[PDB]
Amino acid sequence: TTILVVRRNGQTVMGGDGQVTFGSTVLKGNARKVRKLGEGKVLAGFAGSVADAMTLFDRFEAKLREWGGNLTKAAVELAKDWRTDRVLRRLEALLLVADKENIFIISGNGEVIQPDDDAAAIGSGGPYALAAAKALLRNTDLSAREIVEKAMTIAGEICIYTNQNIVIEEV
Amino acid sequence: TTILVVRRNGQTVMGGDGQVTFGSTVLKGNARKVRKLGEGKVLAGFAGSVADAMTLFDRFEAKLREWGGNLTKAAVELAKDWRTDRVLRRLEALLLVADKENIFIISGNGEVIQPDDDAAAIGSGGPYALAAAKALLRNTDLSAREIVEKAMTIAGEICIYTNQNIVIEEV
Amino acid sequence: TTILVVRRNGQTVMGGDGQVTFGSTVLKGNARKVRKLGEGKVLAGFAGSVADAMTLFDRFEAKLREWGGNLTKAAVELAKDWRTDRVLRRLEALLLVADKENIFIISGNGEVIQPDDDAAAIGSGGPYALAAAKALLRNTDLSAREIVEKAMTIAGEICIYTNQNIVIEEV
Amino acid sequence: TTILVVRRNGQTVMGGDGQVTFGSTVLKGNARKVRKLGEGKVLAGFAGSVADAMTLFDRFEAKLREWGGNLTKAAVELAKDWRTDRVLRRLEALLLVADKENIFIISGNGEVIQPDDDAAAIGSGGPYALAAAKALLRNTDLSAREIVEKAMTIAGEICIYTNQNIVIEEV
Amino acid sequence: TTILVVRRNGQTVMGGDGQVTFGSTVLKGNARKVRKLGEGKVLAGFAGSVADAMTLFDRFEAKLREWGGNLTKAAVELAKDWRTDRVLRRLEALLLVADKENIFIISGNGEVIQPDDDAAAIGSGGPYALAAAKALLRNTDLSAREIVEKAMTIAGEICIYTNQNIVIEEV
Amino acid sequence: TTILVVRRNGQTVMGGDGQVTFGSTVLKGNARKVRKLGEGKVLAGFAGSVADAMTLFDRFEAKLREWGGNLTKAAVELAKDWRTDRVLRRLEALLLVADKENIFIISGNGEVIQPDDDAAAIGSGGPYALAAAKALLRNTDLSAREIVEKAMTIAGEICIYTNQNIVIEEV
Amino acid sequence: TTILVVRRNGQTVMGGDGQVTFGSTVLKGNARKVRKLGEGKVLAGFAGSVADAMTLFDRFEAKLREWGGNLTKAAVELAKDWRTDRVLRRLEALLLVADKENIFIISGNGEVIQPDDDAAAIGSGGPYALAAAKALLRNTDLSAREIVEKAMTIAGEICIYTNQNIVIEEV
Amino acid sequence: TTILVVRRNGQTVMGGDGQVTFGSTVLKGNARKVRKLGEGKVLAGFAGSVADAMTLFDRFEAKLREWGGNLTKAAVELAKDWRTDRVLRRLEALLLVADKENIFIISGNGEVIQPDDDAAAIGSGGPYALAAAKALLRNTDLSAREIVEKAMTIAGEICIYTNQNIVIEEV
Amino acid sequence: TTILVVRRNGQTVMGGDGQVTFGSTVLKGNARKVRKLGEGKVLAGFAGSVADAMTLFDRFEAKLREWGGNLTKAAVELAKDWRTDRVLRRLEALLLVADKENIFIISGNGEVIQPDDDAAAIGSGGPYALAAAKALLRNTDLSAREIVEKAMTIAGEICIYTNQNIVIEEV
Amino acid sequence: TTILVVRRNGQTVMGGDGQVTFGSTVLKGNARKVRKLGEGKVLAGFAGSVADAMTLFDRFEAKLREWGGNLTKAAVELAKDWRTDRVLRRLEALLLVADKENIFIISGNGEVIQPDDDAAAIGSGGPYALAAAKALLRNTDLSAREIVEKAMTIAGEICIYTNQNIVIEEV
Amino acid sequence: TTILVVRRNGQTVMGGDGQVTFGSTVLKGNARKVRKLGEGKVLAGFAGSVADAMTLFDRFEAKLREWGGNLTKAAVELAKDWRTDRVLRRLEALLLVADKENIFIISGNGEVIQPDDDAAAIGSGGPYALAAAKALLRNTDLSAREIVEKAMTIAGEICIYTNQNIVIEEV
Ligand code: NA
Ligand code: NA
Ligand code: NA
């Protein structure tokens, strides 16, 4: 799995591959690992099972409403719940969320991390797409969308756990 | 074990073998691992114990009624419960359900997977039945029922955990 | 431990050895691992501790009453309870039950297995007794009672966890 | 640790060594691992910590009262509780109890075992004392008390986890 | 795999199945695991690879010639070599050899075992074929060949690693 | 990796994918894992390193010369050398060879296996290609060449260690 | 396995059971684990495979000849060889040897141990037979031979790895 | 560690970071992991200890001389030696070599791999530098040298086992 | 991560690096791991997730209020709550707090440690910063602020989990 | 095992216990683990097998001759031989030697250690005897002989691997 | 253990502690872990056994003479031998050598590391001594000898495996 988000020219674009692997066999190749939350204002990507992510996204949606759409506050509060709530604590997944100004990686270990760069990624192929994205951001004038398509494509080329069927969303 | 579902010409067929294994010994060769749910409109197969399957199918039936027969919604909600409910959380069977338009693999790990092809399978011999089904779907005009019959026979021939006693249900 | 059930010409016989092992030492050699339940119409054997067996058999007795002596129904409902009930879930014995027409292996993992043959067995020595039983069933005209005695003896001869002190019950 | 009980000439005698080991160092050499329960009518020995045994003995005392002093019934009921009660289930120890007519080994796994002989033993050195006791019972006319002293002494000689400071009680 | 030898009425017969398994898949179903050595006077079967078996049988043939056809001596000497020789020490197959009077199980661990019964077996399904053979030998007047045929069929039915394609040799 | 051989109506075809994986990253996607040996009469494929394969194929070539093109003899002698030779013993590739009449899987564990069917395969994706191949062989009139191409494609689609860049050789 | 030696009234008697176990199945029940060496003057027992013991006994025989029949010296020199010789060092077994005046336990770790008592034993059931032997030696006037028969019999009763078919030799 | 090689416009450039890590501490930050062989015509990079690499490079130099400067042949022959030579087989490292027309990754497992692209990399940070290099090669007109500097720099940013002190060589 | 506190001549300074590591990749390099609590009189740093830290610091703030700014009392009560509270028990961050007179390391294992020196540190790089800090405290006249900056730099230079982006707070 | 050496006022005394343990059973209680070497001028004790000790002591004797009784030189050269010699390298005993002026602990790992105090010890119980010895050396006027006896007794009292049967040698 | 080398003003100084630890007990506190080689022109320290160190230093001395005192060449060649030579390959000490211009850490894993700073260290406490040395070198004008003295004291204070008894050598 590879989820990548890139911000450039006031646009934030997030992409995700579509491969679902069980052991060493591909069960599905067109998975949609990127969704939209907060009334189409927040991008949300996930590395993990659908049900786990959905339950977490539900709690995240709630947090967004409760704290007036404050992404930073919502992310921290979700991390807290995910960490202590007996239910969510059993969920295994890694999240990547972002609006037009902030990006956060959130984990079940109480982590809320905003990389100090215009790009971030998670999943087994995350670092590959990220390296590519950082390269394109610093040496081309390509748009956020194009960088994501190209970086994700390169990640799929290298990682056996990530494919080339990329789904892209934007806010 | 091998459970295979094939969709063709608006018809959906599911087949399952009958072998039950404990360690290295075959305990039973005529198990029924396939049933019909949702008033005969849904096919359901399982890799696992009878009690686990029944407990899960009962919750699935409820999900179907609650969400107006929406297989996609019902599968997702069942997966969420399987992950949170302390009772279901102990059940370890692997499920395969389908109707005329969709197919879903559901696991106790919150996984809800719909392969992007007209065939899907679970169990130790699943991939063999699947490879055979794909080959037949793409190179013959055989019906969904004919393909399931022929694919299951091959899986039972290759996998030591799958036999040739097949039960078939159709919708 | 070896528990064996053989049915031949309307007669159903169950035999169990008496060896109780702790680590690598025999603590008792005359244990009774077989009994009659449901007003003398059901044969019940177990591979495990006596307290576990007693609690499970009591629940089985209740199921038999609630479902009007239906062995199949009773066995399935016991397995579902065994799998969901907070108390029973701690019980780890392996059970083998039979009446004049059906035979079921029941486990704490939700298993309810009826072998598709006229003999069934559980315990470390089960497979050996089963092999001997099938050989006699298919190549001699010996009665179920004789077969069980002879098969159990051979199992105790081969398995270090099974002895030759056999208890037999018939229905 | 070694706990041994021997019955001979209407007398039941139980002995236990006094060694308490932590890692490879002896912390105490005069431990009292044998107590009297049921108003001085039942002998009770234990391999394990004092607190664990005490809590179990308390529950055993209760069971004895509840079932009219029936040792067999009391032992089975304790085994059941020890197995399922969330509290006792956390206790780690092995028990050896006996009155003037019955002897039972009881474990946290629901086991209630009465050896088919006039002797029984538990603990790391149990089998050594037992072998000795069986030898003396079958080849001498020594009293139960003397057999216990000699057998325990031999166990202490052989096992590094059992010493020669023997405490003996009788009913 | 299952290799069974039965001695009866001065006649010795050895049978072997034909299944070859890699992981969970059957690679071949008609393997020949039984041969004749020592000028047609010795039966030899193996659980393991062809190259290993052949290398071992060649050394065994030499041992037979050297010790004047003494199966007992030849088996012991082969076992010693298998244990010391750096070349043979790498071979891991399990062997079963027999003539009109003796039977020996030989392993690379210096084991040379002659069971004290007129039947012996090796391989994953050996004990099942053995239990069946013992039952038939003690309850029928069937020949060594008939018993091997019937016992092997049963072993192949129970063991997922043994099939029904049997090769039989006799001396 | 997937190497597949299919024989139909006198034509023998071998196909192999081109993916080279190190850990979880693809290092090359156009590898040649199939070649012709013995003056163009023998098909040879391998799952492993190229240096291992070259050394083994060279020894195989020698065996073919020494035994006058006898594939069976050559395969067996190669396996014996592979198992005993101090040099070859360090080689861990898995081989698959075939001529116009025979097919053999050869391993460093002394295995020499000829499947009893008109198709054989090795490598992580072998079973999938095999299942697809058998399905097409038994339910279509497609040639060996077409079957291999189609089966290899399906194997690369399912297995994350096998890609779709196929090399084919025929005899 | 259980090997026991007892000295009393100028007579040294050594006994051994006959059970040979592979996993949890008895392959042979009349094994002869006690031999005579040094021209019928030295008793030699072994826990381990036949070939290993034989090779060690051969080297022991040699040592006895070399050092003029000095059992003590022969045992020490064998221990040295067993420890350093590349061949013997691969042998896995435990030995128990004795003449009319000395008893020694010898291991592949360079151990040569003479217990300070008139009895010694090795094997899984060794301590059980030893405890019994010590009991009979100190409380009866039974002969060495009878003590061995009774102690071994008791060991077979307790240990699942030792049986009641005892072979006895004397010097 | 990260070693990257890029070919563009008839120029082949190889770079390597300078970090040497022991546990979780940096012992050196200006390591030179890239050398020149074959009379300054071949680039050679290594992930592993200095001595191991040096010994391998020595053998590689020899192979280059022996086969007339044929990089492909030299690499294969080194792989063979590294695989079987008792000395080299003990060496633990991964190599990356290249001239102006070919690039090869060589391992101690007999692997000789030429990626099908104008870039290749090894070491823990290899895939990160590679992803970046592939991005720059396909979307900019930067020289091989600049791509290497930028890609390596990005790898150092991401991987904790790779730093920013890059050594670059060219042929 | 490295968090360091140094006190010299009434001045207490705390510094923390900014590297956030997931596995072996740096996700962020400018994290703020140090803050001021208790109305600007308490320095607080942490090695762990931000959500864990926030929850713990909030509880610490409460303790400070309840115990009238008594750092010792507050630290001890926080540790007791951390150890017993069902919520906090899931929090695994390591804390370091200090005011103008005391310094305490607090963990989820009930630890409350005040080093007996004028410097303290936590995190993977703590010991390195501590060593450097003590060296400067004892052999120079540098202020606490200068020492922290210099020590933190050296820690980031040696530890792969600590970087050079330092945040400093003083009281 | 415990071996202790104490030197006080020109007198050097070495004591060793006599317990020999195999697993968790005492096989002998009167072993001699201490001897005199170098014409009665060197005290030598060991924790290990007797064969290992004898071979090592013989080599030590040779070193003492070759280096003119220089204990330091002899101990170092023995350690170097122990570490490089193909034979000695298989020996795993731990040695303790001393003369009227020096004391050395020698191991197969090349260790040559002379404690900087007037007492030294090896074996599982060494530290206990050492603690007791130092206490008596520093707070009483007891002789070396008395101290060793008293310290060894206390060590045997605390350690389950050390008994109270002490052998003493003096120089 | 802690061995530290510091170069300053053309003077090179190496210091080492004297603690020797076995398990959790200090066996000696005045060990000499630092020596002078190459006619007093080279400093050599070690973390490991005396025999190992001496054997390695002897080979190092030879390397120095052979390569005309070239420390860099000698270190590399020693590392190669340590890796190939069957005798040295068993030595496991860690080495630290230096002269007026260079410093090298040498390991049995073929590692030859020269840190890019005027200080280096090995052993459990190395990093602490190193952090202290770097701090002093960059913030004072203290000599190499003064810094080593002060840094070693600090390392001994922090590490439980390093003490305050330091030996210092200079060149
Ligand atoms: Na991919
Ligand atoms: Na099958
Ligand atoms: Na038995």
Ligand code: NA
């Ligand atoms: Na004892």
Ligand code: NA
């Ligand atoms: Na089968």
Ligand code: NA
């Ligand atoms: Na693929």
Ligand code: NA
């Ligand atoms: Na027994």
Ligand code: NA
């Ligand atoms: Na880095």
Ligand code: NA
């Ligand atoms: Na760092």
Ligand code: NA
């Ligand atoms: Na003791």
Ligand code: NA
């Ligand atoms: Na210290």
